[PDB]
Write a protein that binds this ligand. Structure first.
Ligand SMILES: C[C@H](CN[C@@H](C(=O)Nc1ccc(-c2cnn(C)c2)cn1)c1ccccc1)c1ccc(C#N)cc1
Ligand SMILES: [Cl-]
Length: 327
């Protein structure tokens, strides 16, 4: 059992080709072949939570729920003949049939890494090649907008890979924001990304007048903010004298936090307005192991897998791949 022998997808074939084209051109002798596999793809729904449901769904103004496809994908490098899993990502894709405001949008739920890619000097670059390649791929299918919440894990916590190396440091926010800006400046110079904005500038330019026009994703910041804001508003009373107030709060919260939310325009102008439907050429992949991040954090803990050194992470990659061909 090895990474290569995991079934192929167009998405995974495209990403590993862009990465290995990049490495071959670097011609660094420390580097090894990279494999990229989608290991989970399934159809999910995000439910408008009770606050927004009472205000927008009940009045016919907004959809009760938004269908998306979730996918997990992993990248692997040959080190000393052996496969090492060094990068992981979970994405939410909302297609052409999805109602507004979610239509034709991709959202990255979680990404993660184990810092052992060889060599060090190309690590950042290869991570960028994977994310830019992902944005290239969904742009070609007809997705118009990408969405990133720039949010590092808390101290000691693990988004995808169980027990990271003690010396793999969590980036602080400003560094992580600068890292996404570098990846996006490159995607702009390659004419994949048209441009990008902080959520607050995006909303101001789209002239967002209402909370129902804001894209609504599973586990994202903004739906929780809207539930807390609607609850604050409904506590208020006023004696005699002698909605828009939700928009005013959403704007204030978008200004306080603008630096952490990226809106990435993949397709701009009239080109975006007469697109054909989105057909994902890749099939569903059921795989309870990679259905969200939790099951893989649980198996790792239970089988004492760790990604805390090259040897343990090489060991855990092998055990990961066994369990993936099994179920
Ligand atoms: C693509 C790659 C993912 N690296 C994850 C990362 O860096 N995890 C990490 C690193 C360390 C620990 C940890 C937990 N306990 N201990 C002792 C260490 C846990 N997780 C991560 C970082 C941030 C957001 C999401 C994911 C990357 C690497 C560098 C930057 C920058 N600047 C951005 C992305
Ligand atoms: Cl993330």
């Amino acid at each position: 059992f090895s990474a290569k022998r995991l079934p192929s997808t167009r998405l995974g074939t495209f990403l590993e080709n862009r990465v290995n084209d990049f490495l071959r051109r670097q011609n660094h002798p420390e580097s090894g072949e990279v494999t990229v596999r989608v290991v989970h793809a399934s159809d999910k729904t995000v439910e408008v939570k009770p606050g927004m449901k009472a205000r927008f769904v009940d009045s016919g103004e907004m959809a009760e729920s938004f269908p998306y496809r979730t996918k997990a994908l992993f990248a692997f490098e040959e080190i000393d003949g052996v496969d090492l899993c060094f990068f992981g990502m979970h994405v939410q894709e909302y297609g052409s049939d999805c109602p507004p405001p979610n239509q034709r949008r991709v959202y990255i739920s979680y990404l993660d890494s184990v810092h052992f890619f060889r060599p060090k000097c190309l690590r950042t670059a290869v991570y960028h090649e994977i994310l830019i390649g992902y944005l290239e791929y969904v742009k070609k299918l007809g997705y118009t907008t990408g969405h990133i919440w720039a949010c590092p894990p808390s101290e000691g916590d693990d988004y995808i890979f169980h027990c990271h190396p003690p010396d793999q440091k969590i980036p602080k926010p400003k560094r992580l924001q600068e890292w996404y800006k570098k990846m996006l400046d490159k995607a702009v110079s390659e004419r994949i990304v048209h441009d990008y904005k902080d959520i607050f500038k995006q909303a101001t330019e789209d002239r967002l007048t209402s909370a129902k026009e804001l894209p609504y994703f599973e586990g994202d910041f903004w739906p929780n903010v809207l539930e807390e804001s609607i609850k604050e508003l409904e506590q208020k009373t006023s004696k005699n004298k002698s909605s828009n107030d939700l928009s005013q709060k959403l704007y204030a919260t978008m200004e306080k936090h603008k630096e952490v939310f990226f809106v990435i325009r993949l397709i701009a102008g009239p080109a975006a307005n007469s697109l054909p439907p989105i057909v994902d050429p890749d099939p569903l992949i059921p795989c309870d192991l990679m259905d969200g991040r939790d099951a893989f954090l649980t198996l790792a803990r239970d089988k004492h897998l760790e990604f805390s050194s090259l040897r343990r992470a090489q060991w855990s990659t092998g055990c990961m791949l066994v369990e993936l061909h099994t179920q």
